[PDB]
Amino acid sequence: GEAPNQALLRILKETEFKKIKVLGSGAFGTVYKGLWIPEGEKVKIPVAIKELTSPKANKEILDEAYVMASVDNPHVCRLLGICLTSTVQLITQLMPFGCLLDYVREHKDNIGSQYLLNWCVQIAKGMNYLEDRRLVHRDLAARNVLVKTPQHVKITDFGLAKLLGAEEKEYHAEGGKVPIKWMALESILHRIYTHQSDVWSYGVTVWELMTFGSKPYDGIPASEISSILEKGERLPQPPICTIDVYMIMVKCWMIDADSRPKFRELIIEFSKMARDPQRYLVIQGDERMHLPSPNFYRALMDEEDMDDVVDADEYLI
Numbered sequence: 431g432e433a434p435n436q437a438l439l440r441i442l443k444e445t446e447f448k449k450i451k452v453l454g455s456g457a458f459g460t461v462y463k464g465l466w467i468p469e470g471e472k473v474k475i476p477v478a479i480k481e482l483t484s485p486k487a488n489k490e491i492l493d494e495a496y497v498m499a500s501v502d503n504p505h506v507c508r509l510l511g512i513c514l515t516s517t518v519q520l521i522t523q524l525m526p527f528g529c530l531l532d533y534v535r536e537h538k539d540n541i542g543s544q545y546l547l548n549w550c551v552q553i554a555k556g557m558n559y560l561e562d563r564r565l566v567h568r569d570l571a572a573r574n575v576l577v578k579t580p581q582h583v584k585i586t587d588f589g590l591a592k593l594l595g596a597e598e599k600e601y602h603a604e605g606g607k608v609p610i611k612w613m614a615l616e617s618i619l620h621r622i623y624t625h626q627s628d629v630w631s632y633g634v635t636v637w638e639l640m641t642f643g644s645k646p647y648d649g650i651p652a653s654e655i656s657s658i659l660e661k662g663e664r665l666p667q668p669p670i671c672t673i674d675v676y677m678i679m680v681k682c683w684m685i686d687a688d689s690r691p692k693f694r695e696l697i698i699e700f701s702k703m704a705r706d707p708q709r710y711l712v713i714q715g716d717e718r719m720h721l722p723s724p725n726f727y728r729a730l731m732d733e734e735d736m737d738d739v740v741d742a743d744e745y746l747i
């Protein structure tokens with residue numbers, strides 16, 4: 431009894447979008463940035479295009495398309511559709527400033543406490559929406575949070591995301607390359623994933639931001655993480671973090687998954703701290719830091735006549 435998923439899957443003609451440049455290859459495939467021009471509509475939509483014909487690949491890319499077509503939230507990446515070429519392509523909204531992990535590493539000396547705490551609120555809002563949709567992300571990390579503007583981030587990468595039945599409270603997975611250093615202890619031992627195991631990944635994600643992009647358990651091989659966590663060891667307190675912020679991170683790493691805070695409560699706590707940011711994050715020169723917010727599309731694309739550019743958040747069905 432989980433309610434019909436009447437979401438619409440849009441099919442895009444390959445003639446409607448142009449791969450302007452390549453953003454990053456890898457085991458998945460290649461992610462391109464480009465422009466989508468729906469025929470008849472005088473709009474040019476900046477998009478990201480992923481191509482992974484190993485029948486399997488086509489199968490995994492469609493699972494990700496199914497999940498993304500089912501979510502609609504200001505802090506979750508918006509799916510624009512798929513293209514049915516020889517290999518199936520994923521067409522999503524282009525996030526011009528990249529992933530949050532690279533962003534905090536690049537702009538370390540210009541990120542104040544206001545931006546860090548606001549990012550924590552927005553990530554919790556997106557994860558709380560995913561919990562409302564009964565969706566477990568299973569791969570929450572700083573690399574999987576994209577930056578539309580320095581004031582607006584969205585959760586991305588639903589290759590491992592799962593939807594739970596109204597009786598399924600947990601998700602028992604099987605084998606699969608899984609990011610060990612972001613998983614909860616129950617996910618490493620028993621391969622169980624819940625919304626509370628996503629909370630653990632949320633705590634590690636916050637730790638990445640507060641350390642300006644440090645690697646969790648740097649130098650420790652992944653096979654030792656399960657034994658490190660069982661002894662009671664956790665990630666250290668970042669230098670900018672007051673005990674108030676670090677206490678929240680520690681609570682996300684409790685052994686009892688039901689003792690970890692809920693996403694709706696992480697929204698409230700970080701929202702309070704965002705109203706007095708320098709009380710909870712001590713950063714040298716916090717009051718003088720400034721991040722951009724841009725033209726810049728002509729550069730981020732190449733074409734001019736970017737007078738009809740429309741962000742995907744302003745182009746609705």
Ligand SMILES: *CCC(=O)Nc1cc(Nc2ncc(C(=O)OC(C)C)c(-c3cn(C)c4ccccc34)n2)c(OC)cc1N(C)CCN(C)C
Pocket residue numbers: 453454455461463478479480507520521522523524525526527528529530531532536573576586587730
């Ligand atoms: C950390 C890597 C990174 O994000 N780099 C990056 C990304 C982007 N924009 C962007 N927008 C949307 C998507 C996306 O979700 O859609 C695809 C089709 C799934 C992505 C994206 C998603 N994955 C899995 C990626 C892997 C590699 C690269 C990108 C994606 N990315 C931009 O916008 C121009 C830039 C950018 N870079 C190169 C960061 C480094 N410079 C900004 C310094």
